[PDB]
């Protein structure tokens, strides 16, 4: 970004007139789109939950968002995707209780 012209340190680099190049479509690869949003929501209505998902929600409304998050992390494999399931399943629980 703002180089300093010096060979070393907390933003080392040779100074140059910047030039921010146009964005690539690629860099928007996992990008939403209202079509897929419609399709995925619809497909989920028709299909329902998976048994572990069904297990997951029973673990959210019990124990906690922690206890259940570990279970998810173990099942999907990766702590990040776990939380991601829980948040997604929490939104399903919203759309149940306060229908």
């Amino acid at each position: 970004t703002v180089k300093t012209g010096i060979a070393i340190g907390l933003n080392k680099g040779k100074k140059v007139t910047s030039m921010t190049p146009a964005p690539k479509i690629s860099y928007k690869k996992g990008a939403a789109s209202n079509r897929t949003k419609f399709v995925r929501s619809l497909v989920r209505e028709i299909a329902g939950l998976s048994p572990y998902e069904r297990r997951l929600i029973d673990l959210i409304r019990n124990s906690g968002e922690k206890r259940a998050r570990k279970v998810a992390k173990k099942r999907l494999g990766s702590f990040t995707r776990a939380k991601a399931k829980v948040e997604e399943m929490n939104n399903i629980i919203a759309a149940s209780r306060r229908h």
Partner: protein
């Protein structure tokens, strides 16, 4: 496009609906001959995705394979050698079951050309594949500019050489540090870096 609903339904293999289809179809597939001609893709969106078109000269076969490790086919377990190679029972084939499935229908319909293939079902004993073959003698293909590449002599049995999809995977061929051995071709990069190069004026 109904296809977009197919793809996303197909992601839901533990939905009550798909589980039901899974149980009924795998039974059906088990009763038919290990290799049989499929009348049509079980997954028309998937075949679609992998190069299949609904014209004449596109053929779908279905095939069972036996699932598991490769038991070292040796006399009575006998290895006769160093204790490293003394294993029999935990050894795994370096090709995918899918690679086996392709190669076997590809042997049966040897007039066709294996384009690609895809999983469809499995039990404990078996995995099931649908294999997209393509007639290269059928003028519908020969005249189709998008597909006459496979008419070439240079593609005879691409599955047998690991040129299909499953092949270039097992064969470990992608760019980057992770594929230093295997990507220029395993044995080839080897032979290279194991060659003495001798110039006329020695360097």
């Amino acid at each position: 496009g109904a296809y977009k609903y197919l793809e996303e339904l197909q992601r839901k293999k533990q939905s009550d609906v798909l589980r039901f289809l899974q149980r009924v179809r795998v039974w059906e597939y088990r009763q038919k001959n290990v290799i049989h001609r499929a009348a049509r893709p079980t997954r028309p969106d998937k075949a679609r995705r992998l190069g299949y078109k609904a014209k004449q000269g596109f053929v779908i076969y279905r095939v069972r394979v036996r699932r598991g490790n490769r038991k070292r086919p040796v006399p009575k377990g006998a290895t006769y050698g160093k204790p490293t190679n003394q294993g029999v029972n935990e050894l795994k084939y370096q090709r995918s079951l899918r690679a086996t499935a392709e190669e076997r229908v590809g042997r049966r319909a040897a007039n066709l050309r294996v384009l690609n293939s895809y999983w469809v079902n499995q039990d404990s004993t078996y995995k099931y594949f649908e294999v997209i073959l393509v007639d290269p003698q059928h003028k519908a293909i020969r005249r189709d500019a998008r597909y006459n590449w496979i008419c070439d002599p240079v593609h005879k049995h691409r599955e047998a050489r690991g040129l299909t999809a499953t092949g270039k995977k097992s064969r470990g061929i992608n760019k980057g540090h992770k594929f230093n051995n295997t990507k220029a071709g395993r044995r080839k990069t080897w032979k290279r870096q194991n060659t003495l190069s001798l110039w006329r004026y020695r360097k």
